[PDB]
Amino acid sequence: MSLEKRWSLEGTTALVTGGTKGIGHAIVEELVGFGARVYTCSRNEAELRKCLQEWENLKYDVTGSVCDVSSRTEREKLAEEVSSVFNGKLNILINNAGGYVNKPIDGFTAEDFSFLVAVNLESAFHLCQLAHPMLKASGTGSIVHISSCCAQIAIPGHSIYSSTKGAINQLTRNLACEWAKDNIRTNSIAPGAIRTPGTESFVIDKDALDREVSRVPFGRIGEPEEVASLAAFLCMPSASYITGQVICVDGGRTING
Amino acid sequence: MSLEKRWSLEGTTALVTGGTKGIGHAIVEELVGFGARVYTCSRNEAELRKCLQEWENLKYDVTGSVCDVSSRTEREKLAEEVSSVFNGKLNILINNAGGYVNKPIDGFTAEDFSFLVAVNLESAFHLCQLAHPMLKASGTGSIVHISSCCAQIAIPGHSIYSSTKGAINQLTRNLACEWAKDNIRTNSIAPGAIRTPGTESFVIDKDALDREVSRVPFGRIGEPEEVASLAAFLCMPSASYITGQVICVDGGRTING
Amino acid sequence: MSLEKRWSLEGTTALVTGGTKGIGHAIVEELVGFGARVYTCSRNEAELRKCLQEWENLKYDVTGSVCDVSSRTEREKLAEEVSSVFNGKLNILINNAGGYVNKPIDGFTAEDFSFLVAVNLESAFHLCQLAHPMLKASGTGSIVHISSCCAQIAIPGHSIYSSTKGAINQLTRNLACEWAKDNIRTNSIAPGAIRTPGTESFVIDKDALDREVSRVPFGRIGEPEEVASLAAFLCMPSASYITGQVICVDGGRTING
Amino acid sequence: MSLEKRWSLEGTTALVTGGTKGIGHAIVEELVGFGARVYTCSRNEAELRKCLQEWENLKYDVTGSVCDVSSRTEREKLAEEVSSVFNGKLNILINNAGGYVNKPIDGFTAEDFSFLVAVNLESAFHLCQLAHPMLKASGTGSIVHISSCCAQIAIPGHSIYSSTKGAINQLTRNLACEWAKDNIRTNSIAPGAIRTPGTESFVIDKDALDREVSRVPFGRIGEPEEVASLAAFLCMPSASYITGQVICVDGGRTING
Ligand SMILES: NC(=O)c1ccc[n+]([C@@H]2O[C@H](COP(=O)([O-])OP(=O)(O)OC[C@H]3O[C@@H](n4cnc5c(N)ncnc54)[C@H](OP(=O)(O)O)[C@@H]3O)[C@@H](O)[C@H]2O)c1
Ligand SMILES: NC(=O)c1ccc[n+]([C@@H]2O[C@H](COP(=O)([O-])OP(=O)(O)OC[C@H]3O[C@@H](n4cnc5c(N)ncnc54)[C@H](OP(=O)(O)O)[C@@H]3O)[C@@H](O)[C@H]2O)c1
Ligand SMILES: NC(=O)c1ccc[n+]([C@@H]2O[C@H](COP(=O)([O-])OP(=O)(O)OC[C@H]3O[C@@H](n4cnc5c(N)ncnc54)[C@H](OP(=O)(O)O)[C@@H]3O)[C@@H](O)[C@H]2O)c1
Ligand SMILES: NC(=O)c1ccc[n+]([C@@H]2O[C@H](COP(=O)([O-])OP(=O)(O)OC[C@H]3O[C@@H](n4cnc5c(N)ncnc54)[C@H](OP(=O)(O)O)[C@@H]3O)[C@@H](O)[C@H]2O)c1
Ligand SMILES: O=Cc1ccc2c(c1)OCO2
Ligand SMILES: O=Cc1ccc2c(c1)OCO2
């Protein structure tokens, strides 16, 4: 295959969950930049519509619908609509929508636990199940989970969050092996702290920000496009022998003494 | 500290969940063998009572009550009874009770997912929360989770099982760091296939057994005491600088090419 | 930075050791395909000339000289010539040239050990030292080591080979943290078996080929461009927050049960 | 096998390199405490004699000779003498003697590199080869390498040191799989900073001490017996299903955020 085709997503179809802000928004734009047709969602109709209008103004081929991926019935309805829009063929599934709670282990409620498991683990698992027929039908499938680099280390307050992301890292391995025969690859990107609306209150908390940045060799938090570029690469034919991997995008955070 | 005291559990108190069969039964006996007073549980009153009678006949200091650790209210009642019996001081918590479903990713139901999360992950998490005061009050605490070596590799059918155990491996790291200041250590033992009542149908399935054993350098499945010995060691003062680790007891399975 | 610029190597200079065959040849072509000017080397003057003539006919900008990177004095001469050719500014260092011996542990000689350490570990370490000023001067330096996926698992015959690659994987982490202050990133690519006629490698005979085919979920060995693409990506501005990582390119080999 | 027998080293013979100070001295004492007969060595005849006299007064069975394990011919002479003393039957090989240099990457000399590879990697590899017949003859052989927790993270100054320990960690896996057929198990213990007056090590000065104290959740460096206990355990019948593992003994250092 030519270098040009190996580094392109021209003609492909993609579903990115949680695409109106932060990393997901950057992933939508990165995939469109390499020629993908993209479907996205969020929980907020007004914000999603504005995003879709902005993208249509820019001639970006993006469509979408409101979906709370923590709801089983909404996931079912999303997968049905995505299959209808893309005529049953999906090249790319990016499980980006997630959730976060920061508390000491002693403080987590049953509701905190169920919230994090549903949005970080069950959502991705069930969406993978639902998308398997159209990923297989595309003939070339790529699943990317957005995990977290803290699923390899212990950050104060992150116990249940990191545990659900560690579950995602293992699921990545099972998906990669079980669905290889369908020409579907599965990988996880594990970011460090990234500048997004989800981390705006963290950036305002200078004591917390400075402590985290002091552990990053690069001396700064990441930017959304520093995650999105790798997400696009992992979907390209260039990545055809990369499957089952968890790749940290963290400026050296996890390996820093 | 003397070698004798560093390799002893004399005077300690311990809670082992799921102690009537398999690995948990071997852990109860190993801890008692080093002088621990042990509390255990299972879901089956008749089998638990027979175990407790057998142990009393042998002069093993073991008590227990019926508890389904997948139930929030039963966990609360267990922790209250354990605290009452041990006068508020618990040296050792072994989270051994778990559950297992083997299906292709495509086949898992919502109920399979919720079953495995509740019994493998939420049970251990909540019991750790409930036991934290008495672990702290003991002055020297040790938590051991029984994970699985398949939380590092992809075994067909193990997707949700391995993912919940991978969550346990990460939780091990968070517990180890957050509660170090309370002199509590937390580690995980990750067995390969072990000969237990839980694997009896697997051993009858010679095609499945032979395939798994062909991947084990040692050419056999493990025995329960090969897990229980390490569980006892990790609770001894000898293990005072070991915390946050996931140790595979698998005959070389996970590292075998 | 625009998408086009983040995914470009225009204006960069690169040193790739061992570019005359196998993975290294594909890495040279991939870098030139994104606009890099490349310097390469090998021990075989005739093969090096033939490669350089072919790239000149293709209008690629590739330079080279004969160098045995297992020799300290030849590495010093190589680094001085590269610095002269590129006016003391080097964006990219790819340590690709390696050595391979396949024997049981009992069979390795002192010379096998010295051979493997010199070319797989010492050469990369010393070349990094020698290239540090040029890499620092570029302002966006990228070091890529080519390791092996077998630095995480045990493959028959691979003991010393895999051990030197495990050393490279750790060196990657030290380089990433010590030289982050110069905006030099260091990462390792760990291939599985790659189709490489003319190099002694992973696929030593039909038994090794059949073994790898059976253990890779995709049921095939990799192609050189499947490693080279990731090498190019890791050098692009798109990879600006990725450092200290060991990324397996092995079709799922190491994580497959 | 009874509990008492599974936790005993009665009737075993052991070779521990570098038993005159630091961790190795504690390992000798721990092995003798469980009934092992031990052979040890060092380069300092006066220190070796003083240690051997002290153990004789304590009625421990320890033998030794002067040996520089960085020398191929001296390793051959050591293995021949050990085989003579133990009549060709060795239960335990502990590769403890090491070397340590702390410099920035830019500062390492060719001699530093050769020094560290010879004692941390080549010595252990060649001693394993030389001891294989005696270990096989025992029927229950156990090899323990002493690695370092910094083979998983980047500590300032540790580049070549950590890299040689990363090589040891991989060699552990190859030995575990290749020699499982002889019932020889191989594992690595990876300590964090251990209080070791009289050896050049992790704690090079007050800045290193303060750093490690700040990064260890337990807020302290380790003690030699905290490594030695695990070394003894890994040699006991209790550890019969544990092989190919790298176990960190670091108070949580490597996994602490
Ligand atoms: N930022 C970091 O530092 C960081 C670090 C590591 C990992 N991550 C992971 O990166 C992923 C994205 O994080 P981010 O920081 O970019 O988050 P963010 O800025 O909060 O943006 C999240 C996006 O997802 C949508 N979303 C949230 N919950 C949803 C649900 N239940 N259903 C559908 N959409 C939902 C949000 O829109 P609505 O709220 O309108 O639905 C929004 O579009 C998450 O999985 C996160 O855990 C982030
Ligand atoms: N055996 C293996 O190959 C293997 C491998 C890797 C990991 N593991 C892990 O090892 C642990 C023990 O496994 P095992 O093979 O020894 O299992 P096992 O033979 O089935 O025995 C399980 C014990 O736990 C009790 N138990 C089960 N569910 C329970 C619940 N909800 N509440 C309280 N007790 C419960 C059982 O009694 P009742 O049913 O009467 O309650 C029994 O006493 C599990 O966490 C398992 O996932 C096992
Ligand atoms: N299946 C695989 O091929 C495989 C799998 C995993 C990892 N890897 C790793 O990937 C890298 C490339 O592997 P490869 O198989 O393509 O080839 P290789 O045999 O490692 O390297 C061959 C290239 O390097 C040159 N070379 C070798 N030794 C040299 C020396 N001392 N000085 C200068 N140049 C030298 C060769 O040319 P001359 O011989 O003419 O000098 C040739 O251009 C290596 O690090 C290898 O260990 C390969
Ligand atoms: N904080 C720590 O101390 C630390 C942390 C992590 C890992 N480790 C590892 O743990 C092991 C023990 O470390 P350590 O600090 O206690 O001591 P060390 O300096 O590695 O070893 C000292 C012992 O080995 C002997 N020795 C050294 N080089 C030798 C050679 N070439 N031939 C024969 N004997 C030799 C010494 O006696 P002579 O000098 O008299 O020969 C002494 O008995 C080493 O592998 C070390 O790398 C240590
Ligand atoms: O979502 C919030 C968040 C904050 C800090 C983090 C992080 C996520 O991952 C590594 O450090
Ligand atoms: O519980 C059942 C079970 C069966 C096979 C396994 C396993 C667990 O862990 C590694 O292989």
DSSP C217-239: TTSS-B-HHHHHHHHHHHHSGGG
Q: Which residues of C touch A239 (CB under 8 A)?
A: 229-230
Question: Span C1-257: which CATH code?
Answer: 3.40.50.720
Strands of the sheet with A37-42, listed across from one edge: A62-66, A37-42, A13-17, A92-95, A141-146, A184-191, A246-249
Count the helix, strand and coil residues of chain A and give each as a percent rounded to the nearest 5: 50, 15, 30
- Assigned token pair, A106: 């002693």
Residue type, D107: G
CA of A162 to the centre of ligand 6 (A): 24
Q: D223 and B217: CB-CB below 8 Å?
A: no
D188, D251 Cβ separation under 8 angstroms: no
What is d(CA B249, CA B214) in angstroms, rounded to the nearest whole number? 16
A152, A190 Cβ separation under 8 angstroms: yes
Active site residue A241: no
CB proximity C65 to A under 8 Å: no
What is d(CA C128, CA C142) in angstroms, rounded to the nearest whole number? 11
Q: What is the DSSP letter of B154?
A: B
A202, A208 Cβ separation under 8 angstroms: yes
Strands of the sheet with B13-17, listed across from one edge: B62-66, B37-42, B13-17, B92-95, B141-146, B184-191, B246-249
Q: C252 and A230: CB-CB below 8 Å?
A: no
Task: Give which of C160, C194, C19 is closest to C95, Cα–Cα.
Answer: C19
- Assigned token pair, C188: 């390792």
Biggest CA pair distance of chain A: 55
- Assigned token pair, B232: 């006892």
What is d(CA C1, CA C237) in angstroms, rounded to the nearest whole number? 9
Q: Is the dihedral of CA C71, C77, C78, C80 positive or negative?
A: positive
- Pocket (CB within 6 angstroms of ligand 1): A 17-24, 41-44, 47, 67-70, 96-98, 100, 119, 146, 148, 191, 193-194, 196-199
Strand ranges inside chain D, DSSP E? 13-17, 37-42, 62-66, 92-95, 142-146, 185-191, 246-249
CA of C199 to the centre of ligand 3 (A): 7
D212, D221 Cβ separation under 8 angstroms: yes
Task: Give which of A169, D128, B153 is closest to C153, Cα–Cα.
Answer: B153
Please list, in sequence order, all residues whose beta carbon lies within 8 angstroms of the beta carbon of residue C251, skipping any fewer than 6 positions away. Answer: A180, A241, A243, C192, C216, C217, C218, C220, C222
A251 lines ligand 5 (CB under 6 A): no
What is d(CA D147, CA D163) in angstroms, rounded to the nearest whole number? 10
D128, D168 Cβ separation under 8 angstroms: no
Q: B156 and C256: CB-CB below 8 Å?
A: no
Ligand 5 pocket test, pick from A189, A212, A246 with the greatest ligand atom count within 8 Å of Cβ, gives A212
Q: B241 and D176: CB-CB below 8 Å?
A: no
Q: What are phi and psi of D240, to 5 degrees?
A: -65, -20
B23, B224 Cβ separation under 8 angstroms: yes
Q: Facing residues of D189 across strands?
A: D146, D247
What is d(CA D152, CA C83) in angstroms, rounded to the nearest whole number? 33
Atom of ligand 6 nearest to the CA of B202: 4
Q: Where are the domains of chain A?
A: 1-257
Q: What are phi and psi of D144, to 5 degrees?
A: -120, 120
What is d(CA C55, CA A109) in angstroms, rounded to the nearest whole number? 64
Q: Look at the block and give the residue holding tokens 């915390």.
A: B243
- Secondary structure class of D15 (helix, strand, coil): strand
Please, where are the H alpha helices in B18-158? 22-33, 45-57, 72-85, 110-116, 123-137
Strand ranges inside chain A, DSSP E? 13-17, 37-42, 62-66, 92-95, 141-146, 184-191, 246-249
